[PDB]
Amino acid sequence: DPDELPLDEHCERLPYDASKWEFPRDRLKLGKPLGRGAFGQVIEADAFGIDKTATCRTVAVKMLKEGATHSEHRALMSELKILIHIGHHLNVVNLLGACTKPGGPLMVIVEFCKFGNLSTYLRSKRNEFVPYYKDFLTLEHLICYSFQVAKGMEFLASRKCIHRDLAARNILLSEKNVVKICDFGLARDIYKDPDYVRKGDARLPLKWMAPETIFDRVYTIQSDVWSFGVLLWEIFSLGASPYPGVKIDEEFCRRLKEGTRMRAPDYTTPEMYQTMLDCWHGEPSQRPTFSELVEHLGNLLQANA
Ligand SMILES: COc1cc2nccc(Oc3ccc(NC(=O)/N=c4\cc(C)o[nH]4)c(Cl)c3)c2cc1OC
Numbered sequence: 001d002p003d004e005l006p007l008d009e010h011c012e013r014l015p016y017d018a019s020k021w022e023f024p025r026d027r028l029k030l031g032k033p034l035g036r037g038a039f040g041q042v043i044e045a046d047a048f049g050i051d052k053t054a055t056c057r058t059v060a061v062k063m064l065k066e067g068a069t070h071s072e073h074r075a076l077m078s079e080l081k082i083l084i085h086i087g088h089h090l091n092v093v094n095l096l097g098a099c100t101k102p103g104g105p106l107m108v109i110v111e112f113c114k115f116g117n118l119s120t121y122l123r124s125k126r127n128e129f130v131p132y133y134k135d136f137l138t139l140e141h142l143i144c145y146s147f148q149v150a151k152g153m154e155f156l157a158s159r160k161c162i163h164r165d166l167a168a169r170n171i172l173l174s175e176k177n178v179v180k181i182c183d184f185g186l187a188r189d190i191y192k193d194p195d196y197v198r199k200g201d202a203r204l205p206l207k208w209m210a211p212e213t214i215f216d217r218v219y220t221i222q223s224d225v226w227s228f229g230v231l232l233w234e235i236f237s238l239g240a241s242p243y244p245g246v247k248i249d250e251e252f253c254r255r256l257k258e259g260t261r262m263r264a265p266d267y268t269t270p271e272m273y274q275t276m277l278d279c280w281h282g283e284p285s286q287r288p289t290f291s292e293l294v295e296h297l298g299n300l301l302q303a304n305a
Pocket of ligand 1: 034092109110
């Protein structure tokens, strides 16, 4: 079914309306790099007037770096088109503009999320956590983050997109405890990142991948639900690495097929752990949908109050 088909697949037919999205290069001041991959990078910048008249705005800019080729340039352009087509949501990193004019690099400009990726943030807060003192993390915050990511994913699903690398490292934290789904893509160095394992010529986030994705190489929204379950484990471990100490080999993949699951993380509630287990159902059609996760986490959020 073409309607099931992720817009990600046929991006080349998506419009780029420059009269709306093009931002003048002479209004963007590039600062220091925030992160770098092999072929891509994200740079901190100040954009003059990009979202509000005459207002300086700190933004993040994704662009390529030494090593990239025309194929990565094409990939970044497709990413830009995808972001445009998806549209705005509180819990997805918001596109502000782009520089596509010849004579300089392709630049994708998005809102700056000052606290960075959620995994690192949660670990820096282990010292400042109480289950139920200002600036302290609490259980309510953890549930609220989970709810927000479910909302963003429900939204992405509704725009006919699937993420394919959902993990705490791809969630960013902005001010006022708002989290945003991201995909660093080329701006992450995956051959240097332990989270990505060599399988063939590819490097894959095995510890986050559903069984059907590992064995049959199928990516669906329900396999994102499986990954969301792992993300939940990350959140309620305050940013621990999944399957700690475990060797991620073919025996690991088999155990996973058999029904082996992670034990509960140190900060979970019973209901949150059952939710993870639900997300990790061997049968994809028996996992909850993101719509159901949204309703359920909202209920948990209210009960925790
Ligand atoms: C404080 O430190 C950082 C703050 C950041 N704040 C905002 C954005 C950042 O990096 C990006 C991460 C991802 C994308 N792209 C992106 O998310 N593309 C998508 C997402 C989806 C669904 O389809 N395409 C971009 Cl442009 C930029 C940041 C990186 C930081 O430190 C490294």
